[PDB]
Amino acid sequence: WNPIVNVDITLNTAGTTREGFGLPLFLASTDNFEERIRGYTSLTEVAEDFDESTAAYKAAKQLWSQTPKVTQLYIGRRTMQYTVSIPDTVAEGSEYSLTVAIGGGVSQPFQYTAKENDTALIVLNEFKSQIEASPTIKDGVNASVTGMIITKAGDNDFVKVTSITPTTSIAATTADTASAALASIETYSTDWYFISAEDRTQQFVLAMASEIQARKKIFFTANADVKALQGTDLTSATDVPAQLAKSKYTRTVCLWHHTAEFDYPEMAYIAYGAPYDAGSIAWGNAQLTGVAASLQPANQRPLISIQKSALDTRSCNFIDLDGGVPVVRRGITSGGEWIDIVRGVDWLESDLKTSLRDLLINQKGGKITYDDTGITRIRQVIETSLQRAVNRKFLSTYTVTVPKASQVALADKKARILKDITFHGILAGAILDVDLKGTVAY
Amino acid sequence: QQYSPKDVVCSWNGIAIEGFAPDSFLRLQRTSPLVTPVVGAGGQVALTRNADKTGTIEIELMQTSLSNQMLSAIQAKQDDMELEEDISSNFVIYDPSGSVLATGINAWLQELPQIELGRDQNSKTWIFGCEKLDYTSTIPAS
Amino acid sequence: TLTIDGKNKILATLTPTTIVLHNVDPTADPTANKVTQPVAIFFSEPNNGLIASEDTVNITVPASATVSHFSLWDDNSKCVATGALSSPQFFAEEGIYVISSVSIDLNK
Amino acid sequence: TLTIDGKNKILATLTPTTIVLHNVDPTADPTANKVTQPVAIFFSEPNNGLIASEDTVNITVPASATVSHFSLWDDNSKCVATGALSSPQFFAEEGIYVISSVSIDLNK
């Protein structure tokens, strides 16, 4: 039974959302949630599995404050390597406990409390035998003896050990150099566009940037080291912004903020252009609400001109305080390309791929034959796909050239291959800064 | 490399419109002249540049041609789509001889054909609009 | 007598990047007995005052070689920490040595 | 040459069931150098003259062994296909070999 009219007012606030190309994903080193890529649709949902001090909640709050709320936020977990070690000496029959959880059906506790003579070890090695004998834990949990590390091996991927008194300490995330983390997350779902991470180590950050550069995504980082605001020559410093610029990585966005360590200001940057469309926006001068200007960690004052110019050399974006209004300036990737161009290009590939997929897979108007008619069909789809870019105010003109059927080698036809299809579009820029040279005041 | 009606191919919305009538089957036309000169009473002449390049593509397919069902099927689908979705796609016309060198940028389906059943087999004329009938040429700016 | 907060806020700056295998126990500054060519080793984030390698590292071991000790190296070509692997081994022929993990720990 | 339809029919009778690794190219005398055990392998239905493995199989290679070649023994103990791996690998200790995918193909 339901009433004729069901009304339920709450003294909540606004937060009308908007949908656009790109869905953020936050690579957090957590322990909850079922498998990778849990997901969340509102700040309350992200708080039902994470605490205030938790890294994921910190990132979620910044991205989801703004004003146009992002439709959905993806949260993925890095595979975990819990390590155990006795911190004290084994005393007679002191009770030791730990609970290993894999998949969903694993809550087996483990007690040994067997050190009558002396252990000086033993207990951990005793656990090794016990941990490999449990009927529901025997497969999936790889352990060692040290001189233990309950990792994962085969089938089951998620592991978690927890105790109260003895230890069950450390995290030591297994996911290595992005690739390992990426390979896992790709298997689950590949519908995310914007990627970030909780880790800030140089080894890891440089690994994601190289790894992201291969696929069609954008990496949003945030660094706070001082060694970047002093060097004016690129091949002099070892700062991550310098490392990115030297490697010429065009799919990695760097935002130099002083809160880069304990907070994730890159989340705010993502939520500025993600809700809107792809390419019909400028990631340049942006009034990111909430986040403050890029402060100096030494003086707690806004960055000076030389420091900003040094940052401009490494292409890492900052937050310039122009008319005393915190404005994210530059709006460029580490590779020297404007962010909107990279996003628009990625959208153009997706739209071209989808539109061309229809003829080949869904056989819209039938299978494409290898003559002047078939090539024309391909040109129409490519031309149509580029036309949407023009209507989107991304491009202004395009020019698609296709090969003539008679000029096609016999080898390609036998292989059922069509190459030498080219298009040449002209971008439409945006005025981000002016220079008014006033004549006089005579 | 002379004009032959057997190589002229037209493609819209990813389909391969074919089965043209033996007589005039394709008819492109701009809806407005390039310039409209205005002549003063004295005799001075000024030119008005028309910022209206829309055109009209008419196709005469014979009724039993399969593309007639394909185009009609698209039209039926396009009526059920919401107002926000697009209903236009570029109208590429290709001819190796270079007789026709015009594109149908943002072409929509304007008018449904008129069925004229008779003793013999007649044609069905599909009329397509366009936002910019762009005339091109093989010769570049040189 | 450091505290976890401390413990962690210390190993974060360590960042070992390279691992070299040795036949015998390293000296004060191991320079000889380097049996395998150095390879990159990606470590992880400190947590509860200990950092461990995240990537299963495979190193080529030449023929007629023995491996019993290792020395981690940083990006400045300065050996950081030294130790012995659990089980040494003799490679009579050309082969590959695998290290599941190495854990720099401060809990004891 | 055969037809696509002809190849599909013919391939539906090979039906490999087990896979055995080898140390030397098993051309002739395929019963020798039987390093591993006959682990079972499952193949799919023929499609465009090509069969592929239904799932990844793990090979329990014994310690101190070298594997460079394999063979697909069928139900009635016949070696129907030899073949080499990427590079001869020395399993100095106990380990398992992962076969991601093995495909029999006639489109050549």
Contact A404 B96 (CB under 8 A): yes
Is residue A219 within 8 Å of A209, Cβ to Cβ?
Answer: yes
Q: Distances in Å between the alpha carbon of C34 and those of C71, C72, C77?
A: 9, 12, 14
Query: C90 CA to chain D: closest CA distance, Å?
Result: 9
For chain D, the chains sharing at least 3 beta-carbon pairs closer than 8 angstroms are C
CA separation for the pair A280, A276 (Å, rounded): 8
Among residues A96, A132, A137, A89, the alpha carbon closest in space to that of A114 is found at A96
Three-state SS sequence of chain A? CCCCCCCCCCCCCCCCEECCCCCEEEEECCCCCCCCCCCECCHHHHHCCCCCCCHHHHHHHHHCCCCCEECCEEEEECCCCEECCCCCCCCCCCCCEEEEEECCCCCEEEECCCCCCCCCCCHHHHHHHHHCCCCCCCCCEECCCCCCEEEECCCCCCEEEECCCCCCECCCCCCCCCHHHHHHHHHHCCCCCEEEECCCCHHHHHHHHHHHHHCCCEEEECCCCHHHCCCCCHHHCCCHHHHHHHHCCCCEEEECCCCCCCCCCHHHHHHHHCCCCCCCCCCCCECCCCCCCCECCCCCCECCHHHHHHHHHHCCECEEECCCCEEECCCECCCCCEHHHHHHHHHHHHHHHHHHHHHHHHCCCCCCCCCHHHHHHHHHHHHHHHHHHHHCCCEEECCEECCCHHHCCHHHHHHCCCCCCEECCEECCCCCCCCCCCCCCC
Inter-chain Cβ pairs, chain C and chain D, closer than 8 A: 11
* Edge-to-edge order in the sheet of strand B9-11: B9-11, B92-94, B102-105, B132-135
Q: Distances in Å between the alpha carbon of A325 and those of A67, A287, A288, A293?
A: 17, 8, 10, 8
Written as one letter, the residue type at C51 is: I
Contact D92 C95 (CB under 8 A): yes
**H or E element at residue C104:** strand C103-105
Among residues A336, A26, A317, the alpha carbon closest in space to that of A194 is found at A26
Q: Which residue has the tokens 């080793």?
A: C41
Contact A171 C47 (CB under 8 A): yes
CB neighbours of A62 closer than 8 A, spacing ≥ 6?
A263, A264, A265, A267, A268, A271, A290, A291
Query: A171 CA to chain C: closest CA distance, Å?
Result: 6
CA separation for the pair B59, B48 (Å, rounded): 32
**Sign of the dihedral defined by the CA atoms of residues C7, C8, C12, C17, in that order:** positive
Strands A194-197 and A24-28: parallel
C:36-75 residues touching chain D, CB 8 A cutoff? none
Looking at the complex, does the CB of residue C94 fall below 8 Å from at least one CB of chain D?
yes
Strands D16-22 and D39-40: antiparallel
What single DSSP character describes residue D62?
Answer: P
Which of B1, B7, B70, B89 to mutate against chain A (most A CBs within 10 Å)?
B89
Contacts of C95 in chain D (CB under 8 A): 90, 92
Query: B121 CA to chain A: closest CA distance, Å?
Result: 25
Looking at the complex, does the CB of residue A170 fall below 8 Å from at least one CB of chain C?
yes
Q: Distances in Å between the alpha carbon of D60 and those of A137, A426, D52?
A: 21, 58, 21
Angle at A400 between CA A397 and CA A403, to 5 degrees: 165
Looking at the complex, does the CB of residue C58 fall below 8 Å from at least one CB of chain A?
no
The separation between CA A226 and the C-alpha centre of its own chain, rounded to angstroms, equals: 24
Contact D90 C89 (CB under 8 A): no
Q: Which residue has the tokens 């399993």?
A: D91
Is residue A46 within 8 Å of A60, Cβ to Cβ?
Answer: yes
CB neighbours of C64 closer than 8 A, spacing ≥ 6?
C91, C92
Query: A326 CA to chain C: closest CA distance, Å?
Result: 31
Looking at the complex, does the CB of residue C48 fall below 8 Å from at least one CB of chain A?
yes
Q: Distances in Å between the alpha carbon of A5 and those of A2, A8, A9, A11?
A: 8, 10, 13, 20
Closest residue of C to A149, CA-based?
Answer: C101
CA separation for the pair A160, D50 (Å, rounded): 42
Angle at A198 between CA A197 and CA A204, to 5 degrees: 65
Q: Which residue has the tokens 């013999």?
A: B120
Contacts of A372 in chain B (CB under 8 A): 7, 9, 94, 96
Looking at the complex, does the CB of residue C95 fall below 8 Å from at least one CB of chain D?
yes
Contact C95 D93 (CB under 8 A): no
For chain A, the chains sharing at least 3 beta-carbon pairs closer than 8 angstroms are B, C
Contact B16 A358 (CB under 8 A): no
Is residue A45 within 8 Å of A73, Cβ to Cβ?
Answer: no
Resolution of the experimental model, in Å, one decimal = 3.4
Strands, E, within chain B: which ranges? 9-11, 26-30, 38-39, 45-46, 55-62, 92-94, 102-105, 109-111, 123-130, 132-135
